[model samples]
Target: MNKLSGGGGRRTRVEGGQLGGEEWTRHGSFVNKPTRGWLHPNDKVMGPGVSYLVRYMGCVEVLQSMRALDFNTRTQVTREAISLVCEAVPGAKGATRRRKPCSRPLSSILGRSNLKFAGMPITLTVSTSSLNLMAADCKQIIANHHMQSISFASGGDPDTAEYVAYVAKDPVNQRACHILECPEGLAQDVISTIGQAFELRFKQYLR
Candidate 1:
């Protein structure tokens, strides 16, 4: 026996049909008897607020679009759905917010060096410097070996800077690269192969 109005002073049950078509009623007021189709607990007799209902529907649609199971994934999906709703509805929270771009510069983690390849001097520059022709050597190696692209940065601790080369796979495109490191104790064969790759890419510069 609960009195619910739609702003026009009309009394009606807060119909739960959208959720399950079951009628919600209170015992002391204008209550309605439960039908056989009714299911769920009557202890928590409360309807969702306007904003809560809208966000709830939006979250349901988002959940349907994406497959999420774990709590972390569920949280992420909910956040994304909230954003989507805010985008469709003007003046909503987060409607004006935009995601920032990832600016990961290679020089932040890489060191610079110069090497001799096929009688030509090649420099491996990091950071703001223009990548010389030698940088293309890693590209050639990646192409010839059908390897995946990768990224590398300094380990930070122990501060070892020399000449170490290895094939690394890039996370996004699955392409490979000849990642140059400065760890001390690098193999001679690795150095030789890197030098050869450098020469092959810029053979025209060789004298």
Candidate 2:
């Protein structure tokens, strides 16, 4: 029988949409996008890294935060950047519910923030037709979440450098910005990986 959290699929290639696959295993949960394809790298090379929770605020807040960056057009930030806005505050910390590592939870798919890395049981597990944002396996923290647009801060020390923000499509909070505190330049990886993932989904579901 399958256990709770993370599926046990064989990790093969072949695609999805309309609930095609029986199991909802990981497609690509890395800090960066894979160029060759999902076949090249194993899960380790893909992702499952750490990102601190910063501003879990709202829609327009994301745009305001990103606009604060100041750049040019032709920008392809998760293709969903500048997606929302609102407040400009946040907080979420401390959790130790896993030891082996490699428990990368796609908050987008599960529809809630996964803090197993921060040492929390608050994770969303999807069943045949169920979504669980349960903590300790039965508590809902942030449900119906969305990484609407994943953007990163390039160039700089820890101050403004390796920072990544998720312009989340928060169903309840309107569009929210979930900032992830990263190490080095892993923020870029998280942003690009998420972009590539949506690019894949955009192709399948739309095309």
Candidate 3:
């Protein structure tokens, strides 16, 4: 429920897998060697707040285009939805900064990009699961916004890349998790497939 477009202006502007030392310095430091840990405070408190603001603004924009909507209620609804999904996610909660707001909200979990729900529906579930029957209720929001686009940079464990479902549309396109991470993935193969299946199903609900 934060307001950011993922990277928040920290992504390297250079090409190739190699980044300049200045960019590295601007971004942060890497510790833990084999398991490199990025230690830097770019936005620290403002970042997650901005990220939440982005989600808030996105939700506002989406609701404006909806056929039937109320501003106040929708605002509350969107916040509740985002919070619920975040909580439903197992590792998502601990992502908060120690006694401060998160810097890489909607992107990394614990400063590492080992996140599995990036740019997908699973990310939404993680942020919005606390709300009652969120999976069913999120259909409208998903259809209107199509999850959200989110990304993160890391030099940590290359073997651990977090992949979440972020909406493609604007206003409310917060990052969510994919169906593969769902607890019931074993029961439903369709959920495991990638590319617009969740979006299609969400639209079906409207029809």
Candidate 4:
């Protein structure tokens, strides 16, 4: 048997230590807070704006809630969402620094659609390659390619619904997120920005 430099032999495995990481903890098992500076801000597009973190949902449920996501389904969802506010325990510490104010509790908003109102404030920064969401305990960088869809959730009143929802996969997991308190009627500008950012399609050329 040839046992020179190229011969097959027993292999060895070595374990390594973890790196020096920072203090920004994750909100849940799904999201990770970034410690170093970002690289995707070169083609700066939007943000450093305030948006509340309403909930993190599974992609399947979000899609299913749509029932194909038409106007009627959205109407049903949002109207039902509004009812949750009405049914909320009266005066349950309703405050989260609304870009606009509504009568719902931001700390305990139910996903009772489920709805009750609980959300961490997040700063949304958008670049061409990624969407950055920064909460108190977590910061997430969502790659553009992972974004599946963007949708809306209403807080009941047309004047102050406080929601823009989206679904994105992070190479490993899928999250349907509700971003609330978008300022200016607490409406869907975040939805449009995300949609437009995700809408670009560059044609390849071969010369």
User: Going through the candidates in order, what is the number of backbone clashes in each?
Assistant: 14, 20, 54, 13
Every candidate's lDDT: 0.25, 0.31, 0.25, 0.35
Q: Per-residue lDDT for 1-207 in model 3, tens only?
A: 245655445657767765668533555443233321111122221232111100111111112223323322322323333333343443343222223332322211211122333213222221111111122323433322333332221111111122112222323444332212233331121222211111111322243
Q: Write the per-residue lDDT of candidate 1 for residues 63-132, one digit (tens) a residue.
A: 1222334322323332333333333332323422334222212212221211212111232321111122
Q: Model 1: runs farther than 4 Å from truth?
A: 1-60, 63-72, 95-207
Candidate with top lDDT is 4
Report the C-alpha displacement of residue 81, candidate 1, in angstroms: 0.1
Q: Write down the TM-score for model 4.
A: 0.36
lDDT of 4 by residue, 27-121 (tens): 33311332211222323243443234433221212223213333335444333343333334222222222232343222222243223333434
**What TM-score number comes out for model 1?**
0.19
Model 4 spans with C-alpha error above 4 angstroms: 1-71, 81-117, 136-145, 151-162, 165-177, 183-188, 191-195, 199-207
The TM-score measured for candidate 2 stands at 0.29
For each candidate, what TM-score against the reference? 0.19, 0.29, 0.20, 0.36
User: Candidate 4, which ten residues in sequence have the lowest lDDT sum?
Assistant: 57-66
Residue by residue across 1-207, what tens digits does model 2's lDDT show? 477775698868877634435667645454345443211223322343222223222222222222322342112332122111101111222121222222212222112233223323343322211222334334346555223233333222221223344444434554533334333333444434432212233322232
